[PDB]
Design an enzyme around this catalytic site. Sequence first.
Site, mmCIF file in Angstrom:
data_model
loop_
_atom_site.group_PDB
_atom_site.id
_atom_site.type_symbol
_atom_site.label_atom_id
_atom_site.label_comp_id
_atom_site.label_asym_id
_atom_site.label_seq_id
_atom_site.Cartn_x
_atom_site.Cartn_y
_atom_site.Cartn_z
ATOM 1 N N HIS A 68 1.064 -1.118 0.093
ATOM 2 C CA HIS A 68 0.030 0.010 0.051
ATOM 3 C C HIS A 68 0.816 1.234 0.020
ATOM 4 O O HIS A 68 2.061 1.012 0.486
ATOM 5 C CB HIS A 68 -0.868 0.115 1.051
ATOM 6 C CG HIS A 68 -1.640 -1.245 1.426
ATOM 7 N ND1 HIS A 68 -1.303 -2.135 2.104
ATOM 8 C CD2 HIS A 68 -3.193 -0.911 1.272
ATOM 9 C CE1 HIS A 68 -2.441 -3.039 2.175
ATOM 10 N NE2 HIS A 68 -3.458 -2.385 1.750
ATOM 11 N N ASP B 100 2.371 1.707 3.523
ATOM 12 C CA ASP B 100 3.269 0.905 4.072
ATOM 13 C C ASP B 100 4.673 1.216 3.975
ATOM 14 O O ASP B 100 5.697 1.204 4.385
ATOM 15 C CB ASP B 100 3.038 -0.711 3.284
ATOM 16 C CG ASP B 100 1.881 -1.106 3.615
ATOM 17 O OD1 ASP B 100 1.203 -0.780 4.593
ATOM 18 O OD2 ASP B 100 1.430 -2.007 2.504
ATOM 19 N N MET C 286 2.464 -5.613 -8.053
ATOM 20 C CA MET C 286 0.885 -5.012 -7.778
ATOM 21 C C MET C 286 1.128 -3.898 -6.801
ATOM 22 O O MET C 286 2.031 -4.048 -5.995
ATOM 23 C CB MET C 286 -0.025 -6.302 -7.215
ATOM 24 C CG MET C 286 -1.338 -5.680 -6.833
ATOM 25 S SD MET C 286 -1.338 -5.151 -5.092
ATOM 26 C CE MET C 286 -1.482 -6.993 -4.298
ATOM 27 N N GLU D 130 -11.170 -6.172 -4.904
ATOM 28 C CA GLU D 130 -10.838 -7.171 -4.194
ATOM 29 C C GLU D 130 -12.569 -7.261 -3.420
ATOM 30 O O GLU D 130 -12.519 -6.179 -2.462
ATOM 31 C CB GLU D 130 -9.732 -7.049 -3.153
ATOM 32 C CG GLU D 130 -9.645 -8.008 -2.308
ATOM 33 C CD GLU D 130 -8.209 -8.135 -1.542
ATOM 34 O OE1 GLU D 130 -7.235 -7.290 -2.103
ATOM 35 O OE2 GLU D 130 -8.203 -8.741 -0.598
ATOM 36 N N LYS E 268 -14.870 -8.326 -0.252
ATOM 37 C CA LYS E 268 -14.940 -8.965 1.257
ATOM 38 C C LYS E 268 -16.419 -8.754 1.608
ATOM 39 O O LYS E 268 -16.931 -7.818 1.351
ATOM 40 C CB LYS E 268 -13.880 -8.054 1.807
ATOM 41 C CG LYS E 268 -13.867 -8.836 3.409
ATOM 42 C CD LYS E 268 -12.932 -8.046 4.050
ATOM 43 C CE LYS E 268 -12.298 -8.909 5.361
ATOM 44 N NZ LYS E 268 -11.429 -8.183 6.218
ATOM 45 N N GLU F 76 -9.888 -13.358 -2.631
ATOM 46 C CA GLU F 76 -8.839 -13.536 -1.568
ATOM 47 C C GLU F 76 -9.800 -14.931 -0.889
ATOM 48 O O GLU F 76 -11.035 -14.786 -0.552
ATOM 49 C CB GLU F 76 -8.977 -12.452 -0.414
ATOM 50 C CG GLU F 76 -8.213 -13.019 0.807
ATOM 51 C CD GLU F 76 -7.623 -11.871 1.733
ATOM 52 O OE1 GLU F 76 -7.167 -10.791 1.194
ATOM 53 O OE2 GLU F 76 -7.844 -12.095 2.868
ATOM 54 N N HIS G 253 -11.891 -14.301 2.297
ATOM 55 C CA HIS G 253 -12.847 -13.383 2.113
ATOM 56 C C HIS G 253 -14.226 -14.307 1.695
ATOM 57 O O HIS G 253 -15.166 -14.153 1.993
ATOM 58 C CB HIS G 253 -12.651 -12.332 1.017
ATOM 59 C CG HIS G 253 -11.741 -11.422 1.734
ATOM 60 N ND1 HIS G 253 -11.253 -10.136 1.095
ATOM 61 C CD2 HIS G 253 -10.937 -11.341 2.934
ATOM 62 C CE1 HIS G 253 -10.254 -9.648 1.643
ATOM 63 N NE2 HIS G 253 -10.170 -10.197 2.928
ATOM 64 N N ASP H 9 -5.471 -13.415 -3.936
ATOM 65 C CA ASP H 9 -4.684 -13.286 -2.739
ATOM 66 C C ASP H 9 -5.015 -14.754 -2.042
ATOM 67 O O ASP H 9 -6.064 -15.260 -1.696
ATOM 68 C CB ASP H 9 -5.414 -12.249 -1.872
ATOM 69 C CG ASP H 9 -5.055 -10.937 -1.954
ATOM 70 O OD1 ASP H 9 -4.197 -10.556 -2.949
ATOM 71 O OD2 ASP H 9 -5.496 -10.076 -1.162
ATOM 72 N N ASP I 225 -11.860 -12.427 10.023
ATOM 73 C CA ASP I 225 -10.957 -12.600 8.825
ATOM 74 C C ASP I 225 -9.521 -13.206 9.648
ATOM 75 O O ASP I 225 -8.769 -12.335 10.220
ATOM 76 C CB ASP I 225 -10.634 -11.504 7.792
ATOM 77 C CG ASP I 225 -9.522 -11.652 7.009
ATOM 78 O OD1 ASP I 225 -9.280 -12.610 6.596
ATOM 79 O OD2 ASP I 225 -9.260 -10.507 6.526
ATOM 80 N N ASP J 213 -6.588 -14.554 8.205
ATOM 81 C CA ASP J 213 -5.608 -14.739 7.470
ATOM 82 C C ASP J 213 -4.600 -15.500 7.780
ATOM 83 O O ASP J 213 -3.180 -15.128 7.981
ATOM 84 C CB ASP J 213 -4.982 -13.125 7.769
ATOM 85 C CG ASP J 213 -5.547 -12.015 7.083
ATOM 86 O OD1 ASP J 213 -6.196 -12.407 5.882
ATOM 87 O OD2 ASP J 213 -5.675 -11.008 7.357
ATOM 88 N N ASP K 33 -1.565 -12.988 1.320
ATOM 89 C CA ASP K 33 -2.108 -11.979 1.795
ATOM 90 C C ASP K 33 -2.374 -12.510 3.368
ATOM 91 O O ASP K 33 -3.582 -13.162 3.363
ATOM 92 C CB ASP K 33 -3.415 -11.292 1.180
ATOM 93 C CG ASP K 33 -3.825 -9.956 1.987
ATOM 94 O OD1 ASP K 33 -3.325 -9.724 3.280
ATOM 95 O OD2 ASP K 33 -4.940 -9.455 1.509
HETATM 96 O O1 LIG Z 1 -4.893 -6.048 5.208
HETATM 97 C C1 LIG Z 1 -5.557 -5.773 4.206
HETATM 98 C C2 LIG Z 1 -5.350 -6.234 2.802
HETATM 99 O O2 LIG Z 1 -4.452 -5.725 2.089
HETATM 100 C C3 LIG Z 1 -5.126 -5.004 0.819
HETATM 101 O O3 LIG Z 1 -5.632 -3.682 1.073
HETATM 102 C C4 LIG Z 1 -6.032 -6.188 0.644
HETATM 103 O O4 LIG Z 1 -5.597 -7.418 -0.127
HETATM 104 C C5 LIG Z 1 -6.714 -6.646 2.138
HETATM 105 O O5 LIG Z 1 -7.286 -7.691 2.238
HETATM 106 MG MG LIG Z 2 -6.343 -9.410 0.366
HETATM 107 MG MG LIG Z 3 -8.902 -11.208 4.823
#
Ligand SMILES: OC[C@@H]1O[C@H](O)[C@@H](O)[C@H]1O
Ligand SMILES: [Mg+2]
Ligand SMILES: [Mg+2]
Lengths: 388, 388, 388, 388
Positions: free
Chosen positions: D54, D57, D88, D181, D183, D217, D220, D245, D255, D257, D287
Site C-alpha cells: 500500500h 506501508d 501489484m 477485491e 470482502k 481472497e 474473504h 490473494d 478474517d 489471514d 495476503d
Molecule cells: O490487510 C488488508 C489487505 O491488503 C489489501 O488492502 C487487501 O488485499 C486486503 O485484504
Molecule cells: Mg487481500
Molecule cells: Mg482477509
Amino acid sequence: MNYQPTPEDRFTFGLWTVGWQGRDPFGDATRRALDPVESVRRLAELGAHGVTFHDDDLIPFGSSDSEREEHVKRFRQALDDTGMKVPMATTNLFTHPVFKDGGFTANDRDVRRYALRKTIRNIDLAVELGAETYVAWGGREGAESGGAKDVRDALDRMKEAFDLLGEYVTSQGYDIRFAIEPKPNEPRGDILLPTVGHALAFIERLERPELYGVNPEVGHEQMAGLNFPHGIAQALWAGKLFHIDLNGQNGIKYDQDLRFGAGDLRAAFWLVDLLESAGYSGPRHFDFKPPRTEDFDGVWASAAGCMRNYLILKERAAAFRADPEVQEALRASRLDELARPTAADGLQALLDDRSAFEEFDVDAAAARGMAFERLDQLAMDHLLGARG
Amino acid sequence: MNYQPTPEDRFTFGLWTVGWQGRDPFGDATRRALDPVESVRRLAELGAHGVTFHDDDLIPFGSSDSEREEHVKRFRQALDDTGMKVPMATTNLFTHPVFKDGGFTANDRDVRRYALRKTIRNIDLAVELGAETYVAWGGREGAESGGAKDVRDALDRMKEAFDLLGEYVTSQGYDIRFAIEPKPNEPRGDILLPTVGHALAFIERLERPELYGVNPEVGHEQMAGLNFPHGIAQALWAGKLFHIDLNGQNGIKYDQDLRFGAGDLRAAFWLVDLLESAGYSGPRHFDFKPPRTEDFDGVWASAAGCMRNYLILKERAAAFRADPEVQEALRASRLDELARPTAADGLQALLDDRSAFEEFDVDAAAARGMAFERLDQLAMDHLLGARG
Amino acid sequence: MNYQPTPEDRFTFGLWTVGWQGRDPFGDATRRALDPVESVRRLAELGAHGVTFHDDDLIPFGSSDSEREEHVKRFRQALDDTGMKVPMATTNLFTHPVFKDGGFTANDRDVRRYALRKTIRNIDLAVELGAETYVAWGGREGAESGGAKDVRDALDRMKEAFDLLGEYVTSQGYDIRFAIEPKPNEPRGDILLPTVGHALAFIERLERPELYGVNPEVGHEQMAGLNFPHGIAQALWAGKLFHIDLNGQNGIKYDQDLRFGAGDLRAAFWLVDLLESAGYSGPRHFDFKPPRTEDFDGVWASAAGCMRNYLILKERAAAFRADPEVQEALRASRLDELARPTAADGLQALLDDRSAFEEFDVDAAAARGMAFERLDQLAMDHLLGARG
Amino acid sequence: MNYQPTPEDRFTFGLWTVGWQGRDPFGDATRRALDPVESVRRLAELGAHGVTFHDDDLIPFGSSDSEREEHVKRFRQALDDTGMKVPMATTNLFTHPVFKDGGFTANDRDVRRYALRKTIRNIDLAVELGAETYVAWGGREGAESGGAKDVRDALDRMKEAFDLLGEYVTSQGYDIRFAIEPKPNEPRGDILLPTVGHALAFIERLERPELYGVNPEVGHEQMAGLNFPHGIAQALWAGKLFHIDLNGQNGIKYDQDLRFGAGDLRAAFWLVDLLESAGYSGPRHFDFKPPRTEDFDGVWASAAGCMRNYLILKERAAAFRADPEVQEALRASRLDELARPTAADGLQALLDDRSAFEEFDVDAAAARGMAFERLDQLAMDHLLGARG
Ligand SMILES: OC[C@@H]1O[C@H](O)[C@@H](O)[C@H]1O
Ligand SMILES: [Mg+2]
Ligand SMILES: [Mg+2]
Ligand SMILES: OC[C@@H]1O[C@H](O)[C@@H](O)[C@H]1O
Ligand SMILES: OC[C@@H]1O[C@H](O)[C@@H](O)[C@H]1O
Ligand SMILES: OC[C@@H]1O[C@H](O)[C@@H](O)[C@H]1O
Ligand SMILES: [Mg+2]
Ligand SMILES: [Mg+2]
Ligand SMILES: [Mg+2]
Ligand SMILES: [Mg+2]
Ligand SMILES: [Mg+2]
Ligand SMILES: [Mg+2]
C-alpha cells in the site's frame, strides 16, 4: 408513552464501552480517550444505575502504588457525587502482549502465575468498591492451531486457576461471586469454553461450584448461530445467571458490539420477555461499542438507545403476556400442558398405562395442529404495536 | 502402506447410513431400500465390527408383536453368520408425524408418555442384542418460534424423561449407559441442548449422572462453527465420551453427513490424534449418508472410504507424535509446561512469591515467541506425507 | 390501523407453499395434499392477487396429454371464478431422481436435453396462462465434491441452456422474461450461481442479456450471511430485479422458509423501505412453508401473516421517510451529499483542485461525526411505533 | 521430494503481511515494526519473486515530498540488490480516521475527492516501480445500519470513481489494469461488493470494463461460506482473474489471514488444481498474517510455509490428474460429457428429437450412479500421498 430510564432499572455500562476510541484491526482511533470521571458523570445524567471496569481501564498498566491510589480516589469521588454504583468488575488478561497465548492457560507457567496475581489484586479493589460479581472473560485462552494447546491440560489449568480464586475469596471472607463469560472465537481462532453450555458444564467440576455462574453476552452466542434466549433459559434453569451482557450482533461474523436492540430484534424481544418473567434481578449491563463513525454526541446517543430499546421491549413483552387473547392462544398451543409433569404417577404406573402405548391413538394425536403460527403472529403484532 | 480395516478397529455403521434411500427435502428417493440383513453381510465383508439401529429401522412402525419377533430373528441370524456385533441402539422419536413438536418435550402430555413407552420397549431389545450404549438424539425437541416452547419447562420435562429412563434400567438391573447426542438445529429451527457443552451441563442435573454421557457428532458441532476436537477434549476431561459419531461437514449449513475425512480434513486429523492419544476405546461409529448421486456400488465405496480415511489419519497422527523433531518442537512451544500445575506450592506461597508479580519481568516474557507456526507446519507435513 | 390486503397490493403465493405437506429430511408428511383449486379459492379469500406454479405442482409428473388438459381446465376455471392471476411460472428440475446431478448442467448430456425439453413445454403453458416472468432455480446444479463438476464447463452448459431458451421465446414471439434465482447451497453441497451477484454477472455473458434478470429470495442470501437489502439495491441499480421471493430466515443454517417478517425483522423493514421507495412494481411473491407443526388453519394463518407483516412494515417505512425529523437527520448524516457526483467538474479539474489534496484538512474532516446512531434509533422508534 | 521455491514460481507477499505487528482489536502489538528494506531482503532469501505494497506501508502518511523520494530510493535499491519485482500495488483507504465512512463512497463529498487524489498519486508510483496490477479493496465502503448508506447512490459513486481512474490511466498511456477485491464484512458491518460475483457484475457497468478484473481472497469468500474454487472458476470463465490473494480461513468468523494451506485444506487442493490446470499465469500472492503469538523467527517460518504448501499441493494435484486410474474415473463420472455441447444440433433439432423427451427413458437415466464417491476418494488418496 414514556421510555425514560431511572437508576431503579439497574442499567449499567462498562467504562470501555462509551470509552472505546474506535481502533479496529484495520484503522486508527477516531475519538479521544475519555476520563473515567467524565464517563461516570455523563452516564449518570442519562439515567444509568452504575458502571463496571477492568483493572486497566481505571488504573493505567504499570502505575505505581501511589498513582493507583490517586486514580481510585478521583473515581470514588465521582461515584459519591453522582450516586452511581459499581456492581461488577473484571480483569484485563487480554491486551498486553504478555497475554498473547492466554492468562490462566498460557503455555508458560510464569505467565499463568502472573495472571492470577493480577486478578487477585483487582478482586480486592472490586470488593472495596462494592462489586458483587467478578467477571472473567478468557479472551486469549485458546489457539489458532491444533498442536499448540492440549485442551485437557488447558482445562486442568483453568480449573486450577478458578479453584485458587475461590480459595482466596473464601479465606478472605469476601461476599463476591464469579461469572465466566463464554465466547466462541475472536481474538483467538477458537476460545476455550466457547458457549454458555461449555461454561456451565465446566463449573460443575470446580471445587466450590456454588461460587461460580455465567455472564453470557448476546453477540457471543450469536457468533455461534445459537439462540440466545434458549441459552439464557438453560442458565436460569441451572441457577447460574449471575450477570448478563447486552448488545446486538448481525449473525455469524466478527463481534460487532452494536447497541442493544440492534442486530436481531426479535431475539431481543424474547430475551427481555424471559428476563422479566423469570424475575432476573441483576444488572442490565451493556457491553457495546458506539461505532467508530460517531463523534461524542453519537456515543451518548448510542448509549441512550441501549436503555430506550430495553424499556420499549419490556413494555411490549408485558403487553403480550397480559393480553387475554395471547393467554388463550398459549392454551391452544398447550403451553399449559408442557408445564405439567409427564409422569407424576411414577414409572410403574406409566408402564401399566395402556393409554400410553397399546391403546394410544397416534394418528389422532398427530393430526392436532400446534397453532404456533397464530401465536407467533400475535407476538409480532405486540412487538410492532399493531394490535387490533 | 496398508489401510485395510479389521473388526478389531471397532468400526461401526448405522443401518440408516448405507440404507439411506436418498430422499432430501427437495427430491424423491434415488435408491431402493436395503434389507437390514443385506447391509450386515455387506458391511461385514468390508471389515466392519458392527452395526447400530433405530427401533424403526429394524422393525417397521406399526408391526404386530409377531412380525416383530420375525424381523429380529432374521437379523440375529445375520449377526451370528457374520460375527457382527450391536454395540449401540437408539429410538426414532423424529420421523412419525406424532413427534412433530418433539418426543420427550412435546407440549402434549400424551405424546411425551408415548415417547417414553416407545423408548423403553427398545431399550429392552437393545439389551437383548448386547448393546452397551443407548443413544438419544432429540431431533424434534425445539422450536421455530419464541412463544411455542418455554425452555425452562421443556428442560424440566427432558430431565423428567431421562430420570425415568435411568430408574428403569437400574430397576431392571441392566448394564447399559445413555449417551445424549447434541445438534444445534435441523429439523427444528433451534434444538434444545444444541452443543456438547449444553448436554454436559444438563447431565449434571440428572438424578444419577453417572449413567449418562455424550455422543457428539462431527458435523453437528461444526454446524455451530465450533472446534470439534476441542469439544471432544472437554467431554474426555469430564469422563463423559461414551460414544462418537463420525462424518464430514463443509461448514455452517444444512447437515451434509459426508463420509468421514471429507469436510474439514485438518479437523479430522486432530480428532484422530486426540482419540488415539487419549485411548478412547469405544466404537468408531460412522453416521453418514452416501450422497444421493450414487448407486449401490457408490454406497459401499463411500462406506469403505470412511474406514480408510480413519486409518490413514491414524497412521499420520502416530508418525507426528513419534517424530523426535516434533517432540522437540512441542517443548519449544512449552506444551510440557502447560501440563505442569500453575501453583502446586499453594495459594499462600503464590501470594508471597515476588517473582510472580512485583519482580516479574513482563516485557521479557512477552517477547518470547511461542513457535506455533513451525509446529503447525510440521503437523501439515506429516498429514500430507511430506516429511524430509 | 388497517392492515387488510387487497388484490391491488400484488401479493402472490406459490402452489407449493401453502401446499407443502410437511415432509422434511427427517420426517413424514403431517398434512394431506391440497388440490390446486382449493388453494386458489382459499388464497383469493385472504386477499391475494395471484398464484404461481411449477409444472409438476399443477400436472402430476408422467401425466398423459389428456390428463394434462383436464388439470389445466379445472385450474383455469378456478382462476376465472376468483379473479386470481398467474404472473410467474417455473419448472421443477429438482425433485425427480433423473435430476440428481442437475438439469441444465447434469454431467449426462441426455439429461441436459431432457431438462430443456421439459422447460420449453412449460414456458408455452405459462404464456397461455398469462405469466410475464419465468423463474429458474437451479437447485441441483452444483456438487458435493471437487472433482465431480468442472465449473467452467458447467457454466458453458448453463449459458448454452439459457441461450437456447432465449432463442425459443424470441422465435415464438413471446413476451415473457426470465429470472434466475440464486441459492448458495441445499440440496447440493454448493450450488452454481450462489448469490445475486454471481447471477447478475452470469447474465451479462448471455447472448441476449436484456431477456434475463434475477429472482432473489430473502432466506437464500441470508444463508450466505449477506445483507439482502444491499443485494436487492445492486439488482435494482443494474435494472434486473424482475421478481422477488419473500420469506424469513434465522441466519446461516438450512433454508427455513419462514413466513415473511419472521427471521430478521429489521432486514425486512429495510427491504420494504427500498422496494417501496424504488417503486418496484412486480409481484410481492411469498415463497415460504407453513411449519409442519401446523394444521390447515395454521397454514392459512401463516399465509395471512405474510401479507399482514408486509403491510405493517410498509406503513412504518413510509412514516419514517415522511418524518421531518428523519429528513433532517438524513441531512445531518450527509445522505444528500452521497447522491451528488464526486467530480462532475471532470478529471482534469479534480487533479488541479488543491482543496482536494494539497490543502485538504484531513484532521478536520476526520473529526466530523456521521450521526448514524441517532438516525438508526429514529428508524428503530418508527419500526416499533414508539415515536414521541 | 523437493518443495523449494524459486523466483520462477511467482510467489509474492505484501509488505503488510510479514510486517504485521500483531495489533488486533483486543490487544497491543507483539512485534516491532520491520523496515521494508529488511522484508525485501528476507523474502528474497526465502525464494520469493516479489513484494507488493500500500502507499502508506512504504511512505508513512503525511510525509513531505522530500521524505517520500528518500523512502522510494532506499526501496528501489533493495529491489535492485535482490532481483525482487513489484507486480501489484494498492492504496490504503481504510486506516486513517478520515476514511471511517469510506473512501470512494464516503457520504462526505470532500472525502471522496481526497480518496481519488490519494489513489492517483500512488498509481503513478506503482507504474514507476513496474507494477502491472493495481488492487482496490474498499474495506470501509459499507455500513453498520440501514439508513446510513443509500446503496444505489453509493454504487453510482463507486462507478464514478472507477470510471475516473480508468480515464486517468488511459489518458496517461499507462499499461496497468485494476483488480477489485471483494470482502463481505469486517471492518464494516456489511461491505459493498461483498463477493466475487457482485464485483464481476459491477465491472460490467463500468465505462471501460476491459480495464478491470477481480482480486479474490481465499478467506474473504469463505467468510460468506462460499466455495472459493467455484468462484475462481467463474472469474476465469469471465476472463477476469487478474490477481489472487492466498491465505487460510477456518469458516465463518473474523478474517483470520492464516498462512496458505491452513484453514480448509481440501479447498486449497482444489484451488491449486484449478489454477494450474487453467494456466493462471499471474502472481501467487500471499495476503496473510503471521499470528501474534510468533516472534520474528515464526514470521519467516510462516511465510515459508505458504510457499511450501502451495508446492506440495501442486505436486499432488498434478499426480491426481495424470493418474490413468483417475482419468478412467473421470470418464466413469461423465466429466467428458459435461464438456460437450448439449445441443450443437440447434434448437429446432432439439425440439424435433423424440429421444430427448417423448421417448426418453427417465427411469433408466435416473438409475445410473454418478460414481462421484470413488472419484473423491481417489482425490483424497492423492492429496494424502496414500496411493496403492
Ligand atoms: O490487510 C488488508 C489487505 O491488503 C489489501 O488492502 C487487501 O488485499 C486486503 O485484504
Ligand atoms: Mg487481500
Ligand atoms: Mg482477509
Ligand atoms: O471488550 C471486552 C469485553 O469486556 C469484558 O472483558 C468482557 O465482557 C468482554 O466481552
Ligand atoms: O439420521 C439421524 C442420526 O441417527 C441418530 O438418531 C443420530 O445419530 C442422528 O444424527
Ligand atoms: O421450493 C423451491 C422454491 O420454488 C422455486 O423453484 C424456487 O423459488 C425455490 O426457492
Ligand atoms: Mg462481544
Ligand atoms: Mg462482554
Ligand atoms: Mg448429522
Ligand atoms: Mg448422529
Ligand atoms: Mg428457500
Ligand atoms: Mg424461491
